[PDB]
Design a protein around this ligand. Structure first.
Ligand SMILES: C[S@@+](CC[C@H](N)C(=O)[O-])C[C@H]1O[C@@H](n2cnc3c(N)ncnc32)[C@H](O)[C@@H]1O
Ligand SMILES: C[S@@+](CC[C@H](N)C(=O)[O-])C[C@H]1O[C@@H](n2cnc3c(N)ncnc32)[C@H](O)[C@@H]1O
Ligand SMILES: O=[N+]([O-])c1cc(O)c(O)c([N+](=O)[O-])c1
Ligand SMILES: O=[N+]([O-])c1cc(O)c(O)c([N+](=O)[O-])c1
Ligand SMILES: [Br-]
Ligand SMILES: [Mg+2]
Ligand SMILES: [Mg+2]
Lengths: 213, 213
């Protein structure tokens, strides 16, 4: 089996179907105690959660699904009738994502788009009936953040107020993208500093309440 | 200089005087980005916080102060009239702890005792007219947890309801202590699983809001 198949199996064993919180917690545990994986992670996930709650987007685009962790994070906070589209070019990853969404009970709010962003973004208006996007989460290969931002602009998919949220602008880093959006009057930028989710060591406290001799 | 001098300087440089929360955050930042140190840490510190809030102890004894991190955590949550005694054998560390508490503005709630727990525990009743303790936090050298627990009992410092809270019962581990309190009818035990505070890698998200062409 693969790492992504092992993550899904761990979720199926330990999380609760229909409970997105339990799914996030199970992936967090597996990927900090058993095998590291490139999910956005809990620390940066809290920041993502706050951006979703603040802007209450009706239509979100995610670039890079992997196993569905960030899709589960975002979709569980969407208002009724709000939607997430997520693009993923690795079909085995997309297959895991679909199963993860089904387990979490969020499959009716998320649509997986199979293929590469450079091929699918130009299809959003015609094939998927998108007018403009309310929010875009960028988390795919880092050398594509800037070209896809420019493609979204050229295709007329952004409007005033559309929120781009980009992972990993420090590590592995996206210096061309950062230079562009920070230097351009077309974007108002805010940086949110945080941490990667690396492997951890389990420890514990014991509470012992004295009962008398 | 020493690691503990560098930690204290980083706090004085970056935290707000009189603000315990800012002091904790500065220590967290230094000891996860610059140099690891044996503080209880933020994850286990949240559990400590919850125990303090649940039992609202009027008299707390801490075994092992180091730089004052856990003393700041506990003292900032103590109610009016409550006090913390902390024992620290290392005079250099005891001095750092005093400066740390002074900076945080918590010095009037904490009394530092500079000596070894096995020497000072039998003197608490005579030197401070202690009757019994409401809570004990054990976080000193791990081979002393069991003998100091037995000494606290012998010297009459525990009452029915006194809460012992022990750090590191998994890593580095306190197997004799754990076997004793879990096995003994004199203690009712609860385990709180958590994680060590190891070094982290800074990353961040960028929020870029589109304004138009
Ligand atoms: C870091 S992972 C996604 C993690 C996910 N956002 C999360 O937080 O759970 C990166 C993903 O992007 C996919 N990918 C990379 N370039 C892509 C592109 N141009 N179009 C679509 N998917 C892409 C990869 O196959 C991979 O699954
Ligand atoms: C892990 S550190 C304490 C960390 C502190 N509780 C915190 O979370 O910020 C251990 C400390 O215990 C002190 N120590 C070890 N054995 C002791 C003893 N028998 N009596 C008093 N202090 C002791 C050491 O000098 C050291 O500073
Ligand atoms: O190597 N990493 O720490 C990461 C982290 C990440 O969050 C990534 O998205 C990533 N990637 O897409 O290649 C790599
Ligand atoms: O080595 N460690 O990870 C630790 C952690 C700790 O929390 C400790 O208290 C410690 N010690 O007192 O020696 C050591
Ligand atoms: Br691929
Ligand atoms: Mg990422
Ligand atoms: Mg400790």
């Amino acid at each position: 089996d693969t790492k992504e198949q092992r993550i899904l199996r761990y979720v199926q064993q330990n999380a609760k179907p229909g409970d997105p919180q339990s799914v996030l917690e199970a992936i967090d545990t597996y990927c900090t105690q058993k095998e590291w994986a490139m999910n956005v992670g809990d620390a940066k996930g809290q920041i993502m959660d706050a951006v979703i709650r603040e802007y209450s987007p009706s239509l979100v685009l995610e670039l890079g699904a992997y196993c569905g962790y960030s899709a589960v994070r975002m979709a569980r906070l969407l208002q009724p009738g709000a939607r997430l589209l997520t693009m993923e070019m690795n079909p085995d990853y997309a297959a895991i994502t679909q199963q993860m969404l089904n387990f979490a009970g969020l499959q009716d709010k998320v649509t997986i788009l199979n293929g590469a962003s450079q091929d699918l973004i130009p299809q959003l208006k015609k094939k998927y009936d998108v007018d403009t996007l309310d929010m875009v989460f960028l988390d795919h290969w880092k050398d594509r953040y800037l070209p896809d931002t420019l493609l979204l602009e050229k295709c007329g998919l952004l409007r005033k107020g559309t929120v781009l949220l980009a992972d990993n602008v420090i590590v592995p880093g996206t210096p061309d993208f950062l230079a562009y959006v920070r230097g351009s009057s077309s974007f108002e930028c805010t940086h949110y500093s945080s941490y990667l989710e690396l492997m951890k060591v389990v420890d514990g406290l014991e509470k012992a309440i004295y009962q008398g001799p």
